Amino acid sequence: VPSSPPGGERVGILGAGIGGLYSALILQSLDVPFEIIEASNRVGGRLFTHKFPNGGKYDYYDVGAMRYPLPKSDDKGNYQPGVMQRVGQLFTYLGMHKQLIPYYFKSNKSPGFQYFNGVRARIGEGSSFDAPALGINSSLIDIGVTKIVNDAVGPFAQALFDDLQKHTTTGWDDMMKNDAYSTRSYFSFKYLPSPSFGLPSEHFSTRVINWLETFDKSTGWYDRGLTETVLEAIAFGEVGDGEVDWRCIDGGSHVLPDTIAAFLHKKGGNAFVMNASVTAIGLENPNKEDSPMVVVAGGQKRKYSHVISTLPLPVLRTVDLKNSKLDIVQSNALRKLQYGPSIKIGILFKEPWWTTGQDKNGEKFDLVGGQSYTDLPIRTVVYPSYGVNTNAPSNTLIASYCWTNDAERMGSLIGTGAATYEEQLEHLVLSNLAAVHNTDYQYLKDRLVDVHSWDWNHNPLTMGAFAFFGPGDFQDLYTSLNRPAANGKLHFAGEALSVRHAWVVGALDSAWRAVYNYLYVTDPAKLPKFFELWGKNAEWFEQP
Amino acid sequence: ERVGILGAGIGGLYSALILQSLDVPFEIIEASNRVGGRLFTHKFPNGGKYDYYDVGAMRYPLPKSDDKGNYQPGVMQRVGQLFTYLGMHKQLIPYYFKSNKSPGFQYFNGVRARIGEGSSFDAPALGINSSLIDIGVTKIVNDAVGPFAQALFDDLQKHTTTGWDDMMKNDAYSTRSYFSFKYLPSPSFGLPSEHFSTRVINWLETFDKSTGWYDRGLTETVLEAIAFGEVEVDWRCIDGGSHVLPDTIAAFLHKKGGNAFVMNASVTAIGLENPNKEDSPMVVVAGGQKRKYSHVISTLPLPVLRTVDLKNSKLDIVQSNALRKLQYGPSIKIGILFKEPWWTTGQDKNGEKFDLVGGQSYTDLPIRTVVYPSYGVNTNAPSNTLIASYCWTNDAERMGSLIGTGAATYEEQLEHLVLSNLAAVHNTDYQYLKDRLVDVHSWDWNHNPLTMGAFAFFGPGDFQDLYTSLNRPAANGKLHFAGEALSVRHAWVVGALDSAWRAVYNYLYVTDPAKLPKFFELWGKNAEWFEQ
Numbered sequence A: 001v002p003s004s005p006p007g008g009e010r011v012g013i014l015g016a017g018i019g020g021l022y023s024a025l026i027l028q029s030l031d032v033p034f035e036i037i038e039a040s041n042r043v044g045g046r047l048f049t050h051k052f053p054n055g056g057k058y059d060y061y062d063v064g065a066m067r068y069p070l071p072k073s074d075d076k077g078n079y080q081p082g083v084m085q086r087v088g089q090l091f092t093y094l095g096m097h098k099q100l101i102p103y104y105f106k107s108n109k110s111p112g113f114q115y116f117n118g119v120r121a122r123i124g125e126g127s128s129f130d131a132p133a134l135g136i137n138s139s140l141i142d143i144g145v146t147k148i149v150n151d152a153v154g155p156f157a158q159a160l161f162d163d164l165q166k167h168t169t170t171g172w173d174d175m176m177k178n179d180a181y182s183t184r185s186y187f188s189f190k191y192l193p194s195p196s197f198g199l200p201s202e203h204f205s206t207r208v209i210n211w212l213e214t215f216d217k218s219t220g221w222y223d224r225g226l227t228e229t230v231l232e233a234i235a236f237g238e239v240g241d242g243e244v245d246w247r248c249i250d251g252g253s254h255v256l257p258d259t260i261a262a263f264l265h266k267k268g269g270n271a272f273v274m275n276a277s278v279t280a281i282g283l284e285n286p287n288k289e290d291s292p293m294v295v296v297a298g299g300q301k302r303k304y305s306h307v308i309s310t311l312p313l314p315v316l317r318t319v320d321l322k323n324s325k326l327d328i329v330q331s332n333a334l335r336k337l338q339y340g341p342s343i344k345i346g347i348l349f350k351e352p353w354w355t356t357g358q359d360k361n362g363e364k365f366d367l368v369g370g371q372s373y374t375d376l377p378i379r380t381v382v383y384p385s386y387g388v389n390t391n392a393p394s395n396t397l398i399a400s401y402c403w404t405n406d407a408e409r410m411g412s413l414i415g416t417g418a419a420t421y422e423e424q425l426e427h428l429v430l431s432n433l434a435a436v437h438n439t440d441y442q443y444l445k446d447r448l449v450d451v452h453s454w455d456w457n458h459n460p461l462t463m464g465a466f467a468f469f470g471p472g473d474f475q476d477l478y479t480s481l482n483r484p485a486a487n488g489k490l491h492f493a494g495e496a497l498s499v500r501h502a503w504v505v506g507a508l509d510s511a512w513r514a515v516y517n518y519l520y521v522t523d524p525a526k527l528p529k530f531f532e533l534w535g536k537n538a539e540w541f542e543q544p
Numbered sequence B: 001e002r003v004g005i006l007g008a009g010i011g012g013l014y015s016a017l018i019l020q021s022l023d024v025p026f027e028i029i030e031a032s033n034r035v036g037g038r039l040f041t042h043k044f045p046n047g048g049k050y051d052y053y054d055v056g057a058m059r060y061p062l063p064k065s066d067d068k069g070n071y072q073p074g075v076m077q078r079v080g081q082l083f084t085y086l087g088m089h090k091q092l093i094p095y096y097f098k099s100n101k102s103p104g105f106q107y108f109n110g111v112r113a114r115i116g117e118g119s120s121f122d123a124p125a126l127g128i129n130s131s132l133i134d135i136g137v138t139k140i141v142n143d144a145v146g147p148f149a150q151a152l153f154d155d156l157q158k159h160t161t162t163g164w165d166d167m168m169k170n171d172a173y174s175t176r177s178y179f180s181f182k183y184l185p186s187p188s189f190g191l192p193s194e195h196f197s198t199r200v201i202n203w204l205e206t207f208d209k210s211t212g213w214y215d216r217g218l219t220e221t222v223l224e225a226i227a228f229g230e231v232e233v234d235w236r237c238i239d240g241g242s243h244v245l246p247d248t249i250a251a252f253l254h255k256k257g258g259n260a261f262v263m264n265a266s267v268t269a270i271g272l273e274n275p276n277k278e279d280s281p282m283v284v285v286a287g288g289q290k291r292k293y294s295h296v297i298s299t300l301p302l303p304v305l306r307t308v309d310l311k312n313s314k315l316d317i318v319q320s321n322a323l324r325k326l327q328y329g330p331s332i333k334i335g336i337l338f339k340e341p342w343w344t345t346g347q348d349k350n351g352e353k354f355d356l357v358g359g360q361s362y363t364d365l366p367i368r369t370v371v372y373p374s375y376g377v378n379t380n381a382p383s384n385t386l387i388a389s390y391c392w393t394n395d396a397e398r399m400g401s402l403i404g405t406g407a408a409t410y411e412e413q414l415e416h417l418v419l420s421n422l423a424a425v426h427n428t429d430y431q432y433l434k435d436r437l438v439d440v441h442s443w444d445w446n447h448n449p450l451t452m453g454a455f456a457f458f459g460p461g462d463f464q465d466l467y468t469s470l471n472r473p474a475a476n477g478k479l480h481f482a483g484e485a486l487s488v489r490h491a492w493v494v495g496a497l498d499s500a501w502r503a504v505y506n507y508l509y510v511t512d513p514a515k516l517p518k519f520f521e522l523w524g525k526n527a528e529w530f531e532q
């Protein structure tokens, strides 16, 4: 159904993701008419939860967002300052604080497994994983990958964390002076070990750098922007102050967009336009000063005063933006600003063998939540933290969670539609799970029930997992999209338009900035109420 | 004594030719029902003789040749000799890298021009100085890569390795980081003596190659400059599609010695029957049945080996990591069959004739590259098939998501996007092309379990740290790694030939060195070093 603009203002939100839904909450709280246009048959976008039909209450897994490193909170839903504060307040604003259950980043019982170079160990046993055979000095092994990488990113990350506390941008300025570096080129040409390590003051070799990447991140991560590596350290809480409180949503992250879709309806009506793929955006007349915006979605023209686009950048490259009058830098930013891939494989088993089972030698796994890591194709294993300590614990496992090259390669085995490749994938995954945990292949096969795989890099609605900028992207093209187009009536938003890529808070920040520019240009009288309800700044810290 | 060749690609078929010429028993194991691997030609069933297009290999920058199949020295000499060895010289028809008549189109930043008109494509609005625009991207990139390429080209002529040694000293650079931290423009350009900014570098990448290329190894950019002949080359393609090469080699093998192919057999495990016994054979679990061999030559792409069980192959720790870290690149192609060769005979919305015969058109729109058919021209039935899109790196990752969905709704979205971009690049109405469309065929090599990527595309440091590990054998010297990845001519057929040459060389060296003179005499004294 069509909406209605009291005062002549109707905002057209493109995309029913968390970014678009957040824009709706803000506009709805400010008595601004809006309309959400969604290409698919569902809302939530990359908050995608899959429920196995042959499972119980907690036999699901999040294909997209699953964990949230929130600041500490009281029992009433007030969150302390922090990177993810904006997310925590959104949960409280929707009455979801009681649904935020603990997420165990590390195993709540026995440590998770590490399996690299044929060497199997548990996290904390200080194993070398045969690094000496690779040529890694003995001094490096004793220091550790976590300690070395933290020393290189620390200075940058600390400066950005100071921007958030002290309300400055100098930290970003210094970061941008180094944005031309990839994480690799920074280690190869700039980084020098801290004197406290007792190492030679010299740059690392390729062998050492690839050794850092292996245990620190994913294959090919370090070839992308250094800026991304520092930002991901801040989001993960690797270099901050206040302790982080990992949380996930009871029932899957899909509860968040579902609750927001109900909140937006309880007041008035339904402002969603589903199954309508935006094919063109632009001013009705680019020369007229007060021309509205036209959004051709689902083959039907729709008029709006302003448009807030949460579409991922590769999708805008498929939309006709002729009459949107983007400048030459914004046009190029849509193409060059890089995205990253990712795949997830969820398997439903007959039992939570990882919690109660045992290996070939009788040793109990005793894993509750947490993760296991390996250099095998599956790279990462994530055990369910939801449903533990319940009548029906979860039988669902994330048998694979890959990034960058590991996701690009594995993706070819996903979504093929061929029976042969669905079985190859299953045998490969179980085989890697079998090696990582020290069990026979048949032990897991006898417990398999259903398999679900997803490749965000082959999804036409996202065209990539998330933004993952390469070197120089932030310093040359990011700013162009932070200002509007189409005579100020087209606002770019989405997780890509933020410094928290691959996080929900990034989508929220982009919506905040989009509404801020909208109110600033149409109804500045609402800025005080806007600041009071949604914050004075997107990112700079502030008390609840 | 019997060698097990894994993979019926051009690399495996070449290994078979060599072993067959040296009277060495072999057996080819192929997972699919076809031979040629990435030599993939698609024939539209509703088309004519030349209504096909090469999904993989399609063009070959061969050295100049006489009328009897003798090729002068050059990077692609080994390929030319293979065509002659198979009696295919008369089938090598011209390939037009540039339009054989009027130049191809360029469409960047909304500015449309023809190749050669020296358009700036509105670069001044991007901040590109007038001095850079006058010099040009081609002239700048050639100035930065020239030194490296010349040193490597001298290695091939003078038979040395000093050039490669110098290249490896700089392998830690990506092409981007080289411009940002080391490169200084030649004083002859009249530019400031300082490294290029990000804006300028992305401007170079936009017109020189594909989105995201410059984030990968500098070495790869230098090697691809040598393969393309940027150092004269005689571009050629195969009459009827590149599939003729593997098909012709399969016939050459079925007549002499009988058939020796094992099709529809997916290799799932490789290793010694007993890793402790000194003279243990190699076992290859293919199609669920064990097969014994004396030596195994694997042409499987590196990501595929990561899905094979190599427990009893006794790889060292560097080889294990090389399989994972050695990076591959993506690529997609979209071939469209039209009612007529409108690009050759049609006209735009303003009446101006396209007048395009062969060649290529370039744009910053999602399709990036358009390739017009050079095969079938000057025939009763010229080709009506167009390569509407040919992407690399990031352009392929994005487009790939719209390919292979299996859903009719999104296959039409893709078709509308492609035709719409073709409409803008050529200055025609969308309906002008739609009225002439007949069939569409798209392929995403980054979504294919038999390749798991288009080809090797190493990142910084891969050549200098991990490439060597896979060039030595495993499994007590009974497992030899081959394929285009194991070469310095990635994404080229000659690279697969070089890998096969080196694999056979090590095999003969360790089992029957008495055959090395015949091996050298028939297939060359070196994989890469030039010869007559």
Ligand SMILES: Cc1cc2nc3c(=O)[nH]c(=O)nc-3n(C[C@H](O)[C@H](O)[C@H](O)COP(=O)(O)OP(=O)(O)OC[C@H]3O[C@@H](n4cnc5c(N)ncnc54)[C@H](O)[C@@H]3O)c2cc1C
Residues within 6 Å of the ligand: A014, A015, A016, A017, A018, A019, A020, A037, A038, A039, A040, A042, A043, A044, A045, A046, A047, A063, A064, A065, A066, A067, A068, A276, A277, A278, A279, A310, A311, A312, A315, A342, A343, A344, A456, A460, A461, A462, A465, A466, A493, A494, A495, A496, A501, A502, A503, A504, A505, A506, A507
């Ligand atoms: C594997 C993975 C794991 C993640 N894990 C976490 C985590 O643990 N914690 C966390 O905080 N974040 C996580 N994230 C990030 C989070 O999921 C995203 O950052 C956030 O959901 C992005 O929201 P958005 O609104 O910007 O984009 P999206 O959610 O992608 O929304 C875009 C919307 O636009 C629609 N659309 C697309 N094309 C069109 C079109 N042509 N016309 C109209 N509509 C269109 C889509 O269908 C979708 O509804 C993860 C992401 C991934 C990929």
Ligand SMILES: Cc1cc2nc3c(=O)[nH]c(=O)nc-3n(C[C@H](O)[C@H](O)[C@H](O)COP(=O)(O)OP(=O)(O)OC[C@H]3O[C@@H](n4cnc5c(N)ncnc54)[C@H](O)[C@@H]3O)c2cc1C
Residues within 6 Å of the ligand: B006, B007, B008, B009, B010, B011, B012, B029, B030, B031, B032, B034, B035, B036, B037, B038, B039, B055, B056, B057, B058, B059, B060, B265, B266, B267, B268, B299, B300, B301, B304, B331, B332, B333, B445, B449, B450, B451, B454, B455, B482, B483, B484, B485, B490, B491, B492, B493, B494, B495, B496
């Ligand atoms: C888009 C594109 C364009 C190209 N264009 C050109 C060009 O213009 N000129 C040029 O010279 N080169 C070009 N190339 C390069 C050329 O096509 C390849 O370099 C060459 O064909 C690779 O041969 P190979 O034997 O190394 O691998 P492949 O041809 O991939 O052969 C591997 C074989 O192994 C099989 N196999 C896979 N998995 C298994 C398994 N588990 N068990 C058993 N068998 C298995 C495959 O089916 C295949 O038969 C191009 C490549 C691409 C992708």
